[model samples]
Target: NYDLGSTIRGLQGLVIPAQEHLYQFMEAMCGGSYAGYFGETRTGWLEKYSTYNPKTDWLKAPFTDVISETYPKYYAVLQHEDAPVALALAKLLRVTIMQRVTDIYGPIPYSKVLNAAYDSQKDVYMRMFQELEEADQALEDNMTEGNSGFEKLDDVYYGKLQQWRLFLHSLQLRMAMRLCYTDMAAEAQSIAEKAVTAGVIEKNDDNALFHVAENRSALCFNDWKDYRVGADIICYMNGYADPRRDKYFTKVKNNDQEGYYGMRIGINSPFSDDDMITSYSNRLMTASDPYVWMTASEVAFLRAEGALRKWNMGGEAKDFYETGVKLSFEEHGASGAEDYLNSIASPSGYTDPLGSYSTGSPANITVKWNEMGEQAFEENLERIITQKWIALFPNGIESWSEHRRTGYPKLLPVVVNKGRNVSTEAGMRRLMYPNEEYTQNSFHLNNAINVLIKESSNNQGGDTGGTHVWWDRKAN
Candidate 1:
C-alpha cells in the first residue's frame, strides 16, 4: 500500500497521442468544414476556412484528417495489448470511436490496421459486436480478471460499470439497426431483436451524455456563431408547437416573427445570420453544455423502429415510439409532453423568410398513436421516424445515418448546390475516400471502396455522396 491507499492503476504514462490530437482535429473538422456543410453556423473560422472561401488551406486539410484518424489507430493499439480489465475498456473505447470513423471514410482498416488489410464493413460490424460482448461479459461474468483504479482518468464513466453496461447495450441496438439494410436480414434482425433481451438504455439517467466542465469547454457559446440550426428540425418543432422548443433554441431577435429559426443545410446563404438571427439550441449548448453521444430517447426510438420491423424490443412499437418522444421532452425539462404526444398535428413546413429563396412545409403527420398494423405501416413508420428525428436534436451525424436508413421524416434539401461531390439524386449519402488513401494504401482503400453499393448513377465508387453504406438497403 502506498501509505493509506493502493490499487493497480490503469495505463499510467501511456502516451495516447491520438487523444492528444483528437479534440483539436474534431474542432478543426467541425469548425473548419462540417460547420458550413450542416449550416450549423454562419461565421467564425469557418467563414475563412470552409465552404466557399477561396483562401482556405486545402493542403492543411490533411492535418485535421489525420487528427481524428490517429485516435482510433492508437486505441486499437492499446486494445491489442492490455490486462483483462484494461482490454475490455479499450475495446469499448475503440468501437465507440471507430464507428464514427467508419461513418466518415466508409470501410476502415479495423481488424488489421497494422497490416493495412481493411475488412469489409460486414466483417467490421460483426467484430464490433464480438468486442462489445467480451466487454459486457467481463463486467458481468466471472470469467474476467477485474477492475482497476483508472476511474480517476476515465472522463466519461468515472468507473461506473453499470453505466458502461447500458452504453454497450445501447450501442449494440444502434449497430443492429444499421445492419437492418444488409443482405444479412435474418442475422441483422436476430442481433437487433436479441439486444433488447440484454437490456438497453431504460431511462434518461442512463444516457451516454456528459457535460463539459467550464475550464475545458471546446464547443464555446460562440461556436454556434459558425453553426446555425437546420430548418428540418426547427420547423418541425415550431409546427408541432413542440414544448421543448425553448430548450432547443433562442428565438431570433432579428426576425419579425420573433420565434426560433433554423437555416436549411446545403445552402450558401443568400442571407446572413444577422438576417436569420437564429442560433443553436441553448439547453445543452453552452460551454458547460452536455455533449451527448447516446441518450435514452435515442435508444427508445431505435427500439421503436425495431418494433416497426416486428423485432422483439421488449415492448409494442406504438408504446416504444411514444415513449421515445416523451423521453425526449422529459430530457429538455418535462414540459408539454402530454399535449405534445396527443396533439393531432403535422410538422410545420419550413420557410427561408429572408431573401428570394423559400420552401414550404406541409408537415402531413400527427402525434396521435396510429397503432401498428398492415394499413398503418407506411403512416406509422413516418410518424414514428418523424418523432424520433425530433427527439434526436442537434445530432445531425446520426440524423444523416438514420435518414439514409428508413428515409422517414423527409428533410428539405439544400436549395443551393455547390459541392463537386453533390449526390444530385439524394441529399449527400456518403463521403469519398480521402485523397491520402489512394497514394499510400491503394489496394486496401480501393478494395474498401469497391465493396460499396452503387445503384445510384452518381456514386462512382465513393467519389460522390450517392453511394449507400452496407446497411442502408432501401436507398437514399
Candidate 2:
C-alpha cells in the first residue's frame, strides 16, 4: 500500500509558490535591514522590517504555511524508516531552523507543527532544549565512521557527527543564555553547565556554517554590495585595532584616500544606499563563502560570562575570556593571537565619515583578560561581550539577540524613526504576531498573545514587535 504522508509531501512544491520570498525573508531576518537595497529609501519597507503585516512577511500563507505543515510529515518519513536519522533531522529543525522562527515571533507551533497550532516562547524554548537532549544521544548511536549516508545528505556539517554534537552543545549554551534573564538565571546556570560538560564548539575547525557558492551565496548575491559595516562595528573594531577587521570589512572612500567607514543604524536621518558611507570589506566575504552559525570564540566568551556570574561553569573568568580572544584571532587566520592578548588596548572613539559626532569605547578595557583590573564589574562584562560581538560578526540576528539580553556592545539606534511604536525597555523585544495567524489560528494565537502580556515583564502588551518575550528580562 502507498503511504499518505508521501502523497502529501509529493505535492509540497505546489504549496510554496513564492520561493524567492523566503530568500529575501532570510536576507532581512538573518541580520536585519531595510531601505538600503541598492541605495534607496523606502519607509514602508523599513516599517515592515520591524513589524509584519503585509510586506515580505513570512508568516503569511504559502511560505510558513507550507513549511510548518511540511515539517512534521518530513520528520515522520525518517521516523518510520529509522530512529536515528529521524532524531537527527529533529535536532536540525529545532536548533537550526525553528528556533529562529520562535526567536523572532516569540513561540510558535512546534509540538503542534502538523496542525498549525502554537505554543508560548517559554514552552517552545523548553521543548527545543528537551529535543536537543535527545538529538545528542541519537547522533552518537546512528552516526559513525560508516555513516556515509549522512556525509552525502547533510548540508550544514557534511555528516561529521563529532562536530555536529559540538554544534548542538554550543547551540544549547546559546539557548540557555537567551532565557537566562527571565528564568532568574536558574535555567541559564543549569543548561550552560550541562552543555559545556558535553562539549561546546571548541575550535574554528568545528564551527557550524552553511557553505555558499559563487553563483548562489549569502555573501555574493545577498550581501555583496547590499550590506555595509555598521558604525558600532567599524569603530569598535578600528578602536580595538582588530586583526579580524581586515578579514571582516574593506575600508571606505576618504577624500581620495582609503579608510574604514561604518553606517550607524536606526538613525533619525533619511538616506539611500549610495548615500550611506560604509562599504563591504572584501577580506573575508566573497561571491562564494561560508556564513557562520556558531564559532568556538563565541562559546569561550559564553563560558567567560557564565564563569563571571559564579554559576556552575568551572574555571576562572579571566582565562576563559583570554582564551576566547585567542580562538577568535585564530578562527580568522589572524596572526599574533598570543601577542594581541599581551596588552590591553582600549577602543578609540568612532567618527562618522559622512557626518560628525563620535564616541570612545570603555576607557580601561582591552583585549587581554582583565576581570581583575580596575574596570567595574559591568565594564569588564562589556569588554568580554564586545570582543565576542566582534568575533560573532555578520551573524546579526544573534548579535541582536545578545544586545537585547545584555545591552552590551552598544548598537546604534535606527537613524530615523517615524515614531512607529512602543518600547518595553527590552529594546526591540519580539516581532509582532503575523496577520495570517491572527486570522487563521485566532484561538491559539489569542492565547499566545495573552501569555505574553501576563507572563513577560512589563509586556504591557500589544502583539506589536516591541512586546517582550519570556527571556527579555533585566539582569544588569
Candidate 3:
C-alpha cells in the first residue's frame, strides 16, 4: 500500500507552479514596479499586465494549468482513501484558486475541465460559496478527531481545524463583500452574515498563509532587485506617519533621500537603478517567510464594511474598523496603534526623489471614525477601505480587486496608459480572456464573453481589460 499522507504532501507542492511570477506581475500592476528594466519596448510580462494589454497571456497558463491538471490529482487522491480532512483541504484549495481566477477574468472554466465550458463569474461565485460551505462542514465533522495526520504537511494551519474553518469563513466573507454592489447585494449580505455567524479569523494567530522555502524578500534585493515598495503604499503609510512603515518596507539607503522611498507605477524604464529612488523589501523575512493569503485584520475590515452596510456583523462598524487597524499593528509588531487610530492624518503627496513623477495624495480620509455626521456613508466606507488596503499590504491580487470593487485608497494614475480601451481613471477592470482561449476554446470563450456582456446588463465592453466583471457593475 502507498503512503497516502506522503503522496498528498508531495502533491501539495504542485498547488501553485508560478507563485513568484504571479506576485511579480500582480505587485507591479497594483501601483508597484520591478527594477532593472531598460527599454520603452514593452517586453516584460509585468508591463503587459500593468498596461492592461488584453492580448497577453500571463494569467491563464499558471492558474488554468493548476485547476485543470493538478486539482484533479487531489480529487483522485481523495477518492482512494476515506480522508475527509484531505477532501476538505482539496475543496478549500480549489475554491481559493478558482476565486482568484473568476475575479481576474469575468468568467472561466469551472465545472468542466476536459474541453471545458466556461462558467459565468456569478455562477462561479455561487459554486465557490457552496464549496466553501461544504468544506467547512466536512472539517467540522472531523474537528474532534484532531491531528489529521496532515499537520506536518499543512503549511497554513498545521492540522488545526479551527484555523482552517476560520480561513474558510473569512474567505467567504471577502468574496461575499465583492458582490455588495451587484444585484446580489441582498445575497451578499446574507452570505456575509452566515459567514460571520460561522466564525472567522479575528486574531493574528489564526491568519492563513503559505510558507515557502524560497527567500521572497531577498528576491527583491539579491536575485532581481525586482520588487520596490510601491509609492502608493509608501505615501499612504508615510503620510499617516504609520508605525508599520518600517515593518513593511526598508528605508532608502541614499543619504540625500529621507525615510522610505518607492518606485511609482508605470514609470518608463531604461533609467538606471540610481534614477529609480526606491526602497527594498523589509529584511525581517527570511527564506521561510510565509506568503500571507488572508489575515484576521482583513477579516476585521470585512466585518467593519458589513456592519457599515447594516449587516449583523457582531459589533459596530467603528469598533470593527478600529479593531482591524489595531490587529494589523499588532500583527506587524508596530507600536502606536492607539495614536495612529486617533490621528486625523491624510496620505502624503508622493514626490518622486528622481523628480520624474510626482502627484498629490489621492485621498483625504482620516483615521478616526467620526464621519457619522455628514457624508457618512461614502466617507466612512472610504476610511474602512483605506485602512483595509494598508493592512493588506503587498498582496496585489486582493488589493487590485478591492480597489476595483470599492475605488478607495486612491492610487496614482499610471504614468503611461499604453492600454487600449483601458481608462486611466477607472483603472483596469478585469483581465481579458487569454489568447489561448481564443484559439483552442473559441466557442466557449465567446459564450463566456456573451455572458459577461449580458450579466452586466450590456454595460461590459466585451472581454476587454476595460470591461467590468459581473460583480463590478457600478463605475468607480
Find the candidate with the highest TM-score and give its number: 3
In lDDT terms, how accurate is model 3?
Answer: 0.71
Across 1-476, the per-residue lDDT of candidate 3 in tens digits comes to: 55555445434443333255544444433323211111112324344554555236555654455455555566666667677777888778777766777787778788776456888889899988888888898988988665767788676677788888988999889999999988888988999999999999988988887666673544543455544566677777788999888887667666566577655666565555544424333323456666678899999999998888888899989999999999999999989999988898888888877676678886788888885723498788888988998888756667777877888767777677787677877777777666777888788878888888887633546877778888876553
What's the TM-score of every candidate structure?
A: 0.82, 0.83, 0.90
Q: Rate the local accuracy (lDDT) of all candidates.
A: 0.60, 0.61, 0.71
Instruction: Give the range of the ten consecutive residues with the poorest summed lDDT in model 2.
Output: 34-43
Residues 1-476 of candidate 2: C-alpha lDDT, one tens digit per residue: 44533322222221211133453344433344321111112322454343222243553532364355457556555545555755565455445666666676676777776526677878888888888888888876777775646565455576678888898888888888777777546876798999999888877888876553331334333453444555667666677677777777676555644766655444433545545533422234554565567898999999888878776656778888888998988887887777777656666665655554344542445666654633456776877787788787756567666776777766544434433355423345556666777777799888778877766775644676567667777655
Residues 250-281, candidate 1, lDDT per residue (tens digit)? 66654355676666555555455655335333
Candidate 1: C-alpha RMSD after superposition:
5.3
**What's the best-to-worst order under lDDT?**
3, 2, 1
Error of 1 at 69 (Å): 5.2
Which parts of model 3 have CA positions greater than 4 angstroms off?
Answer: 1-18, 26-47, 54-59, 66-69, 215-222, 277-284, 371-375, 457-460
**Candidate order by decreasing TM-score:** 3, 2, 1
User: Per-residue error at 143 for model 1, in Å?
Assistant: 10
| Every model: Cα RMSD to truth | 5.3, 5.0, 3.5
Off by over 4 Å in 1: 1-81, 142-148, 214-224, 272-284, 372-374, 453-461
